[PDB]
Design a binder for this molecule. Structure first.
Ligand SMILES: NC(=O)C1=CN([C@@H]2O[C@H](COP(=O)(O)OP(=O)(O)OC[C@H]3O[C@@H](n4cnc5c(N)ncnc54)[C@H](O)[C@@H]3O)[C@@H](O)[C@H]2O)C=CC1
Ligand SMILES: NC(=O)C1=CN([C@@H]2O[C@H](COP(=O)(O)OP(=O)(O)OC[C@H]3O[C@@H](n4cnc5c(N)ncnc54)[C@H](O)[C@@H]3O)[C@@H](O)[C@H]2O)C=CC1
Ligand SMILES: O=C([O-])C(=O)[O-]
Ligand SMILES: O=C([O-])C(=O)[O-]
Ligand SMILES: [Mg+2]
Ligand SMILES: [Mg+2]
Ligand SMILES: [N+]
Ligand SMILES: [N+]
Lengths: 359, 359
């Protein structure tokens, strides 16, 4: 049996998570999987307002008893600053459980109104491999001469050979397994004079060990432009913490909505539990009207089963059936308003769950 | 009589600059303007291979004798590293001439095949105000334990109250003058725990002085998504060095092509000459076939005349005539392949010059 730590967090995380669990429980029944869910109320801004911290001091001790983390979203800027909420919860999960690979697939499904003109199904099908433990996302630095005309703010970005090499290796290994065998590296080696030339140097060094893999590097500005103008060129896109963050909102947007995009925060060595969550945040401006798209949450669940399954064919079939159910519901138009439909969050969850059971 | 330092630089900069000068000379004749062009062969990789530096040591002394700099593009990664070429030339112009405001308009013109579905003229019309002197673009830091497994790379981002306030003031001043009176601030105050919450704090402080201006802040990832999904929402977009760079390729891409996007590197106080250039780079992949879109270069020239004119109204009329001519040529389909046309670089430049004269 697999033990799952379910952590809804803030906002629409509370709306979409139960729909993810619903579909997972339907998948478990169908394929005879043994799954056990425990729900935690912390890693939320409500917990912060009561305790002065996002999580209890022994959070890591508690979560290490679980096989994986199923996570909604964190953040409520009306009550708690965004840097406090994220760094006090999700970023601690990512860094302390060494979940260095952030896998975020981008796909245009049949029946989706595409944001891009003259694009067909097949034109948008790639994976963002995002470095998840270092880089531009930092709490290093500080402020000098605060509250004066001479005020200076410094922010450090750290890249290591260990961290850079391991994300590049994962991306090239992934490309090798895929049909197109192609890696695009996100860079900015003109403007960032130290970090990015180094990233390029390590990319070149890694690409040499993969004779079968075609590779190119693109400055982040023109890469974003190409997501819009020629998304067909991409298969595996490898990027730093910040660049990967940007590309994994932009990609899904080109495919029509951010509401379907899942993410796997993987510790591939399996020394710590991995974390599965939507790309999207807590969406405070739609929380409460139950119109949040639950597909991102559900797809994240499918990725979780695929990762936990390893050698077990039951878990792979459960993943495949969940994707099948998602595809069918989208084709039917049984979707939320962000995809042009009229169904509520709960109705979409129910539709996917029912479709899955009827497969 | 205004003295213009023409610096084509590398690649397609050599192709598009003459087309810019050609249109400027036609505008000069039509409106009785006094323009003198001097071409400089440095700030190029050819110069670097000969002398070991991008520019002569006395470049600043030479250029301070001119009223404005008309710049093509710099970069040739086959022979000179991108960080060396950019930092040794353009970035010195921007920082030593304190050209802290980088103005980058984004517009969907009639007759352009839009990259976005179900979008029409009036849905994409905004301006990116990019901080041009500090922020994430940095050569501060370095490498520790090089060529070992312990290898670390550090890069520092610097923001100052002086620098942050002046760019925000410019953006809010600009919004106040415009019809929609709206500022969107590009941020990432969850991941970047020091620099971006500070940027937000200063934006809040500045916004308080503008009761007529509505303002919102958006995390950079979802902001990029909204450029694709709802570009009609934007009027003035203010951003750091890095975020402004990304958004000023993404915006024009949504509008159909990067080949039309101009940029004005302004020192508003006029202590130093300002620089006018296309957003696009040297495009080594198309250099030689004369298919490069010269409109970005030409539009940049119109912006130059607008800025230089000050009180002289025939310089404003020249800008207006040049934009008029650009619009008519685009509507006629007399355009380069990037806009779906079959004309060469020289034919487009000729078409704009001829149209201008006939107005
Ligand atoms: N992994 C995480 O826990 C992340 C947390 N956040 C946090 O979330 C809060 C809001 O940040 P935003 O920049 O607004 O990002 P967001 O992803 O929460 O929302 C951006 C926009 O997309 C829409 N949206 C998001 N998910 C949707 C869904 N499932 N269905 C339909 N529409 C959806 C929202 O309505 C909003 O207009 C902040 O506190 C931020 O720090 C943001 C991104 C990731
Ligand atoms: N301000 C400047 O002088 C800048 C210089 N660069 C430099 O330029 C070099 C190439 O960089 P890239 O990332 O390829 O950016 P790029 O802007 O030069 O080209 C990107 C893509 O857009 C196309 N493109 C660019 N301008 C075009 C035009 N006017 N008409 C039709 N197509 C056009 C190119 O063919 C290429 O596929 C690098 O060395 C880089 O450092 C890049 C950006 C700005
Ligand atoms: O913080 C974010 O926006 C993320 O992880 O996608
Ligand atoms: O360097 C760049 O890419 C720019 O300034 O647009
Ligand atoms: Mg994100
Ligand atoms: Mg750029
Ligand atoms: N999330
Ligand atoms: N340029």
């Amino acid at each position: 049996s697999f033990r799952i730590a379910a952590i809804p967090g803030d906002g629409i995380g509370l709306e979409v998570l139960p729909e993810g669990i619903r579909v997972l429980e339907a998948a478990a029944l169908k394929h005879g999987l043994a799954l056990e869910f425990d729900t935690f109320e912390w890693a939320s801004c409500d917990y912060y307002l009561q305790h002065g911290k996002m999580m209890p001091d022994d959070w890591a001790e508690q979560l290490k008893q679980y096989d994986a983390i199923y996570f909604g979203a964190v953040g409520w800027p009306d009550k708690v600053p965004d840097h406090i909420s994220l760094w006090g919860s999700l970023l601690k999960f990512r860094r302390e459980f060494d979940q260095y690979v952030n896998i975020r697939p981008v796909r245009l499904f049949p029946g989706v109104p595409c944001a891009l003109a003259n694009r067909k199904v097949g034109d948008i099908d790639f994976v963002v491999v995002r470095e998840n433990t270092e880089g531009e996302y930092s709490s290093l630095g500080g402020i000098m001469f605060e509250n004066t005309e001479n005020e200076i703010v410094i922010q450090e970005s750290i890249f290591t050979r260990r961290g850079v090499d391991r994300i590049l290796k994962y991306a090239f290994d992934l490309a090798e397994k895929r049909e197109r065998k192609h890696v695009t590296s996100a860079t900015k080696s003109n403007g960032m004079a130290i970090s990015m030339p180094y990233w390029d140097k390590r990319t070149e060094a890694m690409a040499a060990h993969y004779p079968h893999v075609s590779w190119d590097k693109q400055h982040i500005d023109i890469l974003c432009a190409r997501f819009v103008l020629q998304p067909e060129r991409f298969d595996v896109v490898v990027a730093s913490n910040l660049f990967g963050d940007i590309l994994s909102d932009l990609g899904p947007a080109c495919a029509g909505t951010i509401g379907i995009a899942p993410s796997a925060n993987l510790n591939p060595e399996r020394n710590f539990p991995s974390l599965f969550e939507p790309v999207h945040g807590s969406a405070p401006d739609i929380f409460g009207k139950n119109i949040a798209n639950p597909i991102a949450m559900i797809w994240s669940g499918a990725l979780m089963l695929e990762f936990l399954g390893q050698g077990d064919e039951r878990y792979q079939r459960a993943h495949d059936d969940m994707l099948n159910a998602i595809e069918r519901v989208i084709a039917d138009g049984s979707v939320t308003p962000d995809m042009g439909g009229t169904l509520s969050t709960q109705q979409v969850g129910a539709a996917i769950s029912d479709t899955l059971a009827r497969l």
